[PDB]
């Protein structure tokens, strides 16, 4: 299972056809054949890495996901860098099962995950409090959070606080463009929602984070720039990654061995946009520095 046959490797011509059907499977369109050929070479290299890395018996595996035609350097730059930086709980939690999570979004080639992370926890807390699941505007936070840097990264806590002090509009009222424009908040009329505050989970503390997740999805950060993270396909991700967090995501559950993480790279990444990250190793940073900096919205 995922995402090619051993028969595909026995021949250049086969590799090409494999690459062809992977482009179709992801609606990949390139400028010219020069890029297409370039992309094949990248594809070919990540295939080789995947195939070699999947021999090794870890608890997760890599795959020809949406980022398979990208070099890790290319990937580092474009989908990593969203951070401007600096009591008996259920055995299992998954807020997807309570209707509190909207469908998976795609930040595109924009360092905006700080807004995506925040907005996701906001949508969730309002469902939990008021009973309705809505989609809210990442573009608004992108454009309007003066402490953040738009597509060059920002702070989740800053985005949450904006929503607590002012409000946020609906996705459909302020749609995502993946580019920072001027603030258009006042042009859209009244806010759709307003939170009442922001709290921070005690950092470097797994138990504290789990407790929080059991009440609300939490906005957390991790280091996502690694090639194993990039090509991640399924299973419990156990490393390797450092503690130089560079990406913002939403913790929307956990089990005995893992914390459930909603990413914002579309459904063509990971377990349909999600990753399960190893927990309980005692390590106070968390795998990929997951426990570094966690915030969640408050809604009376
Ligand atoms: Cl520490
Ligand atoms: Cl801990
Ligand atoms: Na969304």
Exposed (0-12), middle (13-18) or buried (19+): which is 179, by Cβ within 10 Å? middle
Residue with tokens 């969640």: 296
Is the Cα torsion angle 171, 173, 178, 181 positive or negative in sign? negative
Are 207 and 109 in contact by the 8 Å Cβ rule? The answer is no
Token match 């399960």: residue?
276
214 C-alpha to ligand 3 centroid (Å):
21
**Whole-number Å distance between alpha carbons of 263 and 220:** 11
Structural determination approach: X-ray
Distances (CA, A) of 216 to 100, 163, 213, 272, 277: 9, 16, 5, 21, 18
Q: Are 7 and 18 in contact (CB under 8 A)?
A: no
CA 136, CA 142: separation in Å to the nearest integer? 12
CA–CA distance, 94 with 140 (Å, rounded to integer): 28
- Give 203 Cα–ligand 2 centroid separation in angstroms: 9
Pick among 3.90.70.10, 3.40.190.10, 2.40.37.10, 3.40.50.720: CATH of 1-300: 3.90.70.10
What is the distance between the alpha carbons of residues 112 and 73, in angstroms, rounded to a whole number?
18
Ligand closest to CA 266: 3
d(CA 204, CA 198): 18
Residue 38 Cα distances to 16, 76, 116, angstroms:
12, 18, 31
Resolution, angstroms, 1 dp: 2.5
| Alpha carbon distance 234, 241 (integer Å) | 16
Q: Report d(CA 158, CA 156) in Å as an integer.
A: 5
If DSSP codes are grouped into helix, strand and coil, which group holds residue 95? helix
Nearest-Å Rg of the Cα atoms of the chain is 19
Q: Encoding tokens for residue 60?
A: 């997760």
Query: What are residue 41's phi and psi, to 5 degrees?
Result: -60, -40
Torsion over CA: 154, 157, 159, 162 (sign): negative
- What 256-259 contacts at long range (C-beta under 8 Å, 24+ apart), as own/partner pairs, is 256/91, 256/92, 256/280, 259/209, 259/210, 259/213, 259/286, 259/290
Q: Quick one: CA dihedral 52, 54, 59, 62, positive or negative?
A: positive
Distance CA 178, CA 232 (A): 24
Of the listed ligands, the closest to the CA of 279 is 2
Could you tell me if 233 and 61 are in contact, meaning their C-beta atoms sit under 8 angstroms apart?
yes
Nearest ligand to the C-alpha atom of residue 243: 1
How many Å lie between the centroid of ligand 3 and the Cα of residue 106?
Answer: 8
What's the distance, CA 219 to chain centroid? Answer: 10
136 backbone dihedrals φ, ψ, rounded to 5°:
-115, 170
Nearest to 138 by CA among 112, 110, 99, 164: 112
CA atoms within 13 A on the CB side of 87: 7
> Which residues in 196-205 are b (16+ Cβ under 10 Å) and which e?
eebeebeeee
Nearest-CA neighbor of 176 among 115, 118, 127, 126? 115
Distance 245 CA to ligand 1 centre (A): 13
Neighbours of 91 (CB within 10 A): 7
Single out the residue of 268, 271, 269, 251 nearest to residue 260, CA to CA: 251
What are the contacts of 212-216 at 24+ separation with CB within 8 A?
Answer: 212/294, 212/296, 213/93, 213/251, 213/252, 213/253, 213/254, 213/259, 214/89, 214/90, 214/93, 215/296, 216/95, 216/121, 216/124, 216/125, 216/128, 216/296, 216/297
DSSP annotation of 154: B
| Ligand 1 mean position, distance from CA 125 (Å) | 29
* Short-list 27, 62, 58, 60, CA closest to 45: 62
Collapsed DSSP state (helix, strand, coil) of residue 289: helix
* Segments of the chain assigned E as strands: 60-62, 93-94, 197-200, 218-222, 232-237, 247-255, 258-262, 274-278, 295-298
Residues 6+ apart with CB under 8 A from 173: 137, 188, 192
Residues 171, 137 contacting (CB under 8 angstroms)? yes
| Measured distance between the N- and C-terminal CA atoms of the chain, rounded to whole angstroms | 45
Ligand 1 centroid to Cα of residue 259, in Å, is: 20
Q: Kindly report whether the peptide bond that precedes residue 208 is cis, defined as omega within 30 degrees of 0.
A: no
Give, in order, the Cα–Cα distances in Å from 300 to each of 73, 160, 197: 44, 15, 9
Cα 283 to averaged position of ligand 2 atoms, centre (Å) = 6
**Domain extent listing, the chain:** 1-300
Torsion, Cα 134 137 141 142, to 10 degrees, reads 150
């Amino acid at each position: 299972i995922v995402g090619y046959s051993q028969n595909d490797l026995t021949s250049t011509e086969r590799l090409i056809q494999l690459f062809e059907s992977w482009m179709l499977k992801h609606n990949k369109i390139y400028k010219n054949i020069d890029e297409k050929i370039y992309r094949f070479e990248i594809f070919k290299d990540n295939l080789k890495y995947i195939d070699e890395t999947n021999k090794k018996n870890n608890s997760y595996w890599l795959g020809l996901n949406v980022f398979a035609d990208m070099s890790n350097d290319e990937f580092k730059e474009k989908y990593t860098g969203s951070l401007a930086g600096n009591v008996n709980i259920p055995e299992y939690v998954d807020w997807r099962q309570k209707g509190a999570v909207t469908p998976v979004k795609n930040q595109g080639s924009c360092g905006s995950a700080w807004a995506f992370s925040a907005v996701s926890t906001i949508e969730s807390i309002i469902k939990i409090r008021t009973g309705n699941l809505n989609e809210y505007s990442e573009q608004e936070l992108l454009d309007c959070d003066r402490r953040s840097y738009g597509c060059n990264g920002g702070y989740p806590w800053s985005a949450l606080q904006l929503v607590a002090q002012y409000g946020i509009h609906y996705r459909n009222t302020y749609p995502y463009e993946g580019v920072q424009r001027y603030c258009r908040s006042r042009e859209k009329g009244p806010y759709a929602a307003k939170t009442d505050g922001v709290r921070q989970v005690q950092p470097y503390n797994e138990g504290a984070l789990l407790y929080s997740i059991a009440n609300q999805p939490v906005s957390v950060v991790l280091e996502a720039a690694g090639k194993d993270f990039q090509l991640y396909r399924g299973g419990i991700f156990v490393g390797p990654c450092g503690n130089k967090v560079d990406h913002a995501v939403a913790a929307v559950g956990y089990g005995p061995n893992y914390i459930l993480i909603r990413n914002s790279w579309g459904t063509g990444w990971g377990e349909n946009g999600y990753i399960r990250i190893k927990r309980g190793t005692g390590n106070s940073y968390g795998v990929c520095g997951l426990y570094t900096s966690s915030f969640y919205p408050v809604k009376n």
